[PDB]
Structure formats: structure tokens, C-alpha cells
Amino acid sequence: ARPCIPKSFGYSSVVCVCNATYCDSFPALGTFSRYESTRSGRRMELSMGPIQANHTGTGLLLTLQPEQKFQKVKGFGGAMTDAAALNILALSPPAQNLLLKSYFSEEGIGYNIIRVPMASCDFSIRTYTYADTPDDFQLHNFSLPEEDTKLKIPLIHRALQLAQRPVSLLASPWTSPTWLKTNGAVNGKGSLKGQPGDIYHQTWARYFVKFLDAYAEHKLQFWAVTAENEPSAGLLSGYPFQCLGFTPEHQRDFIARDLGPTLANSTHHNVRLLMLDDQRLLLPHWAKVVLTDPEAAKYVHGIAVHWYLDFLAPAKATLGETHRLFPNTMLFASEACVGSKFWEQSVRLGSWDRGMQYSHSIITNLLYHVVGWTDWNLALNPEGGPNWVRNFVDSPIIVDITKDTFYKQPMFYHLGHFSKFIPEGSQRVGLVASQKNDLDAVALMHPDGSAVVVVLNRSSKDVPLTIKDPAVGFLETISPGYSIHTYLWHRQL
Ligand SMILES: *[C@@H]1O[C@H](CO)[C@@H](O[C@@H]2O[C@H](CO)[C@@H](O[C@H]3O[C@H](CO)[C@@H](O)[C@H](O)[C@@H]3O)[C@H](O)[C@H]2NC(C)=O)[C@H](O)[C@H]1NC(C)=O
Ligand SMILES: [Cl-]
């Protein structure tokens, strides 16, 4: 427990300053633990309180329903892009370790997921794929460049060595080699040539196996792959960075005829395949097109979603309805970042609002059956880059290279309030409120049977409340305006 070194840049809250020698780091019975973060500057502060036998009053009461069991959690993490790798590696090795520990160790927030782009995306400094020699249908010339072998792969190793928990890797491609594409370019409107089942589709499926083979030779194995990053982007004329367009029918036939059979016939047949990897407004339509074909469905473990157009997609109509029709196909949130809108400032150092966007999104996803949530770039520079098309965004950790300093933003702690306290295999359970309120809250059970409740207060008003666990007792507490709290207690004791 070293405390946050706070620094303001004139926005609503502070960042925590870390460097080569310093970084901030991390109950009895029947007491509960409370972790709290506030706009005013508290950073995952620990306190404790008594679990009471009785409660009286008419105040807000949140009641656990521990016998209502919902989805099990896969976990939380972020993406190791070329830009994240280049940023982290621009620090001195000691500052690098403190940055990886912040995310991956028990002294930090315990990430257990790392998303890995297959070749280049907009958060790359050059465009490249793994098989750029034209008409190499044999993929004889497939190979990993230094972006992978010298940047991403060694950092992923280091994160695994530091990791508290077992870490799951997830791969997604942005574009194919350009000689496989209708438009011959890495961006713009265009798709695989021909139709699924053919030589182009067969080659593209083999590229995935080649990628898995090459990472396996570097001693990394993958938990999952997605069939394409944002397949709908490549349907859009002028789309400015790497993409590869699929309608839902095209994705259905490609999974059924090429990508599913190819992976199932390889040494990597245990890797899960996620469909969609795109905006949730596309659900449930895309799930119905793909999953009602039993040749496609037998290969699809789950559905990945991105948050960018959520304001158009109420979770009930999209996530909820998809769960209702396809309860056994997990929903997983695979990409989010703030500062993506063209009128937004890319990086707002110390923004409390951006933190709340994360935790509000995460809670809403958990309440609609989503099993994990993945941030985008692990780290960026103060401009939100590098990025070859200047599509700068925000990141929970901002690296200041000329100073060998990095900043942990409020997004980092809002994330930590879930990732740290909700390990893989945790299970969400029911939670009901006694009256209308401005809190977002979710309850889960840890694998050992203990309880975890996360409470975000979306309003400026302090809200006193009680949490009832039936046959354990009552936790009397207060939720300050804008704050985020995580409550942990042993019930089974
Ligand atoms: C790495 O970050 C470290 C944490 O901020 C930083 O160290 C700490 O530096 C400050 C400022 O020099 C020291 O601060 C203050 O303490 C002095 C001495 O008592 C007071 O007179 C000042 O008013 C001030 O509040 C901390 O005591 C110091 N020590 C630690 C370990 O926290 C390092 O300097 C940073 N490294 C670089 C290259 O900047
Ligand atoms: Cl402003």
C-alpha cells in the first residue's frame, strides 16, 4: 500500500503519478470490506464495517438474491496494440514493470485478459499484414514482423510472469493481405474476393492457423479468436483504416465452410471462436443469421460486442433479447475507449466523467448477461497515439516518455473496481432495490462463495443505503455523489 501521488491537469479529478521508482499499489468476521474511489481524490481506499443482524428504517435497501444465478465471468483486461507496446517500451525497464504490475499483479488490478491484433490496425505506425507477398495462396511467406517478435510478444510474456491469475489471450484481425480483397487495399470498402468455400476464403482461414502456429512457437497460446474486427466497417465507403467487410450471411458462410472447419482440423481446435466483434445494435439480427444455421452454430462459442454505438442500442432489446434466444452462447464485450468521437478531445488527463463511463458500461453489461469486458489500448501517449490515421483516443494509462512518467487515470480505477474483485468463474446473482434510485449496482458471488457488490453513484447527491444479504445480515453504508464502491464480505462463514 503505497498511496496515489495525485496530479491535476485542470479537469474534474486527478491522475496518479508513477515513475521508475514509485507507483501506487494495493475481511475479518462478520465484517465487510469497502473499497472507495471519489472525484475528490480517493483511490480504491479500504475501510471496514460491521454486518448487522437487524435493520429498521425506510431508506434505500438493496437486497441480494443469492439463489438467482446468472452468467459466470470470464474476466477483464485490455489490448496490446503496437501503440501500447511502443508506449510501454519507451519507459525505463523499472517503470515498465511498475506499469505491467499496475494492470496484471495482485498489487495492482488483476487483469486476466489481453486482446491482441492480428497484424496492423489504426493503432499501428505502419500498415502491414503477415503475408504481404502477392498471390502467396500457399502462405509460404507468412511471417511475424518485429512489431510482434520484439514488441508485443515480449510484453505479453512479461505480463504473464507478473500475473496473479491465469491470463486469456484473444486475437482479432482488422484486414487480410490486400491481394485477397475486392479493392486491393488495406482500408476502404471491400471484402474477400469470391465466395466462402473458395480459394480466397480457404487461404484466409489458413492465415488464422498460421498466426496461431507462429504465436505457439513463441510459447503463447490463445483462449479465443474473433472472426473479424468490426466486419461492418468494410461495408463502408472510404472507411479510413484497416478493415474487411462481411454482411452477416457472408460471416455465417465463412465460419461454416472455411474458418470453423479449418480451426477444428488444426492443433488449435480448442481455441474458441467469437462472432460479430462489432456494435451491439447489430444484435439480435446477426446472432439469428449466424446461429440458426447449424453448420455455422456448431463452431461459434460466443458473440463479441463493442460499445461505440450503445446510445442507439438499449441493452434489453439487443443483449437481453440475444440471451433469451441463445442462452448458451456467451456475450463478451471486446472493445471500448472514450475520446473516439470527432468532436471529443482525445485525452483528458484526470477526467472523472470518463471513468464513470467505463463503470456504467461495465455494470450495464453485467446486468445483461455479458461475461467479460475488455478495454482498448493498454497505454497511449499524451496526444492519444501513435496512430497512422491520427484516430487518437483516451487510455486508462498515459505515458509521458520524455519524463519517464506514466499517469493512471480515473478509468484505470473504475476498471479496477471490477477486475480486481471479480475473478474468473465468479457468478452474477440477483439484486433488487426497494425504490427508484440513481445508483448502478451489480452483485456477484466469488468461486469461494463470498459476495461482491459494486455501486456507482451517477448523481451528485450522497445516497445512504443498506445492503441486505438474506440470512447473513445488513451492511449500513453511504454512497457519496459520483463515487464508486466495491463491497466484499464472506457469507458462507
Ligand atoms: C519518482 O516519483 C517519486 C514519488 O513522487 C519522487 O519522489 C518523492 O519526490 C518528492 C519530491 O521531491 C519528495 O517530496 C517531498 O518531500 C520533500 C522531502 O521531505 C519535501 O521537502 C517536499 O516538500 C515534498 O513534499 C518525496 O519525499 C520523494 N520520496 C518518495 C520516495 O516519495 C521521485 O523524485 C521521482 N523520480 C523522479 C526522477 O522525479
Ligand atoms: Cl473543456
Provide DSSP, 396-421. SEEEEGGGTEEEE-HHHHHHHHHHTT
| Closest atom of ligand 1 to CA, residue 20 | 1
Q: How far apart are alpha carbons 328 and 462 in whole angstroms?
A: 40
Integer CA distances (angstroms), 240 to 235, 243, 341, in order:
12, 9, 15
The neighbour count for residue 249, using CB atoms within 10 Å, is 13
- For 272, phi and psi rounded to 5 degrees? -80, 150
Q: How is 160-199 classified by DSSP, letter by letter?
A: HHH-SS--EEEEEES---GGGBTTSSSSSS--BSS-TTSH
Q: How far apart are alpha carbons 284 and 201 in whole angstroms?
A: 26
**Best residue among 14, 18, 21 to mutate for probing ligand 1, ranked by most atoms within 8 Å of CB:** 21
Residue 284, preceding peptide bond in cis (omega within 30° of 0): yes
Q: Which of 230, 321, 383, 424 is catalytic?
A: 230
Rounded distance from Cα 345 to ligand 2 centre (Å) = 8
Residues 6+ apart with CB under 8 A from 145: 128, 130
- Counting ligands in written order, which one lies closest to the CA of residue 21? 1
Q: How far apart are alpha carbons 232 and 247 in whole angstroms?
A: 7
Nearest residue (CA) to ligand 1, atom 10:
5
| Closest atom of ligand 1 to CA, residue 404 | 38
Q: How far apart are alpha carbons 358 and 275 in whole angstroms?
A: 23
Integer CA distances (angstroms), 53 to 30, 58, 454, 476, in order:
10, 17, 22, 11
| Closest atom of ligand 1 to CA, residue 5 | 5
Confirm if 386 and 410 have CB atoms less than 8 A apart: no
The neighbouring-strand residues paired with 171 are 116, 225
Nearest residue (CA) to ligand 1, atom 3:
22
SS3 485: strand
- Cell numbers linked to 342: 470527432
Residues 6+ apart with CB under 8 A from 249: 289
Q: How far apart are alpha carbons 260 and 271 in whole angstroms?
A: 11
| Closest atom of ligand 1 to CA, residue 403 | 38
295 is catalytic: no
Rounded distance from Cα 352 to ligand 2 centre (Å) = 13
Our CA angle for 426, 33, 72, nearest 5°, is 5
Of the candidates 233, 215, 254, the one whose C-alpha atom is nearest the C-alpha of residue 175 is: 233
Rounded distance from Cα 33 to ligand 1 centre (Å) = 31
- Cell numbers linked to 337: 475507449
- Counting ligands in written order, which one lies closest to the CA of residue 344? 2
**Which residue ranges have their beta carbon within 6 Å of ligand 1?**
5, 19, 21-22
Confirm if 172 and 229 have CB atoms less than 8 A apart: yes
SS3 374: strand
- Counting ligands in written order, which one lies closest to the CA of residue 351? 2
- Cell numbers linked to 452: 461482491
Rounded distance from Cα 10 to ligand 2 centre (Å) = 9
147 is catalytic: no
Confirm if 340 and 393 have CB atoms less than 8 A apart: yes
Q: How is 205-218 classified by DSSP, letter by letter?
A: HHHHHHHHHHHHHT
Q: How far apart are alpha carbons 78 and 21 in whole angstroms?
A: 24
Q: How far apart are alpha carbons 449 and 79 in whole angstroms?
A: 30
Place of cell 502456429: 213
Rounded distance from Cα 103 to ligand 1 centre (Å) = 24
**Superfamily for the 30-72+427-493 domain:** Golgi alpha-mannosidase II (2.60.40.1180)
Residues 6+ apart with CB under 8 A from 466: 55, 57, 59, 60, 61, 62, 474, 475, 476, 477
| Closest atom of ligand 1 to CA, residue 19 | 1
The neighbouring-strand residues paired with 285 are none
Domain extents in the chain: 5-26+73-426, 30-72+427-493
**Best residue among 2, 18, 19, 400 to mutate for probing ligand 1, ranked by most atoms within 8 Å of CB:** 19
Of the candidates 453, 463, 482, 395, the one whose C-alpha atom is nearest the C-alpha of residue 103 is: 395
Integer CA distances (angstroms), 409 to 63, 286, 308, 342, 434, in order:
32, 35, 20, 21, 34
Confirm if 394 and 411 have CB atoms less than 8 A apart: yes
SS3 491: coil
Nearest residue (CA) to ligand 1, atom 29:
22
- Cell numbers linked to 253: 458462410
Of the candidates 124, 113, 114, 223, the one whose C-alpha atom is nearest the C-alpha of residue 175 is: 124
- Counting ligands in written order, which one lies closest to the CA of residue 91? 1
Nearest residue (CA) to ligand 1, atom 30:
22
Place of cell 471500448: 336
Residues 6+ apart with CB under 8 A from 267: 213, 216
Fill in the amino acid letter for 412: F
Rounded distance from Cα 105 to ligand 1 centre (Å) = 25
Rounded distance from Cα 280 to ligand 2 centre (Å) = 30
Q: Which of 36, 228, 335, 424 is catalytic?
A: 335
Rounded distance from Cα 261 to ligand 1 centre (Å) = 59
If you compute the radius of gyration of the chain from its CA atoms, what whole number of angstroms results?
A: 23
- Counting ligands in written order, which one lies closest to the CA of residue 11? 2
| Closest atom of ligand 1 to CA, residue 18 | 2
Residues 6+ apart with CB under 8 A from 448: 492
Residues 6+ apart with CB under 8 A from 276: 226, 231, 282, 283, 286, 287, 290, 303, 304, 305
- For 181, phi and psi rounded to 5 degrees? -105, 140
- For 69, phi and psi rounded to 5 degrees? -110, 135
Return the CATH number of the domain spanning residue range 5-26+73-426: 3.20.20.80
Experimental approach was X-ray
Of the candidates 288, 274, 283, the one whose C-alpha atom is nearest the C-alpha of residue 320 is: 283
- Cell numbers linked to 333: 464485450
- For 112, phi and psi rounded to 5 degrees? -135, 15
Confirm if 87 and 78 have CB atoms less than 8 A apart: no
**Best residue among 14, 22, 98, 402 to mutate for probing ligand 1, ranked by most atoms within 8 Å of CB:** 22
Count how many Cα atoms sit within 13 Å of the Cα of residue 299 in the half-sphere of its side chain: 26
Q: How far apart are alpha carbons 261 and 213 in whole angstroms?
A: 16
Q: How far apart are alpha carbons 134 and 203 in whole angstroms?
A: 13
Confirm if 212 and 266 have CB atoms less than 8 A apart: yes
Confirm if 27 and 38 have CB atoms less than 8 A apart: no
The neighbouring-strand residues paired with 357 are none
Rounded distance from Cα 40 to ligand 1 centre (Å) = 22
Breaks (C-N over 2.5 A) in the chain follow: 26
The kind and range of the H/E element at 373 are: strand 370-377
Nearest residue (CA) to ligand 1, atom 39:
19
* Resolution value in angstroms: 2.3
Q: How far apart are alpha carbons 3 and 114 in whole angstroms?
A: 27
Confirm if 444 and 427 have CB atoms less than 8 A apart: yes
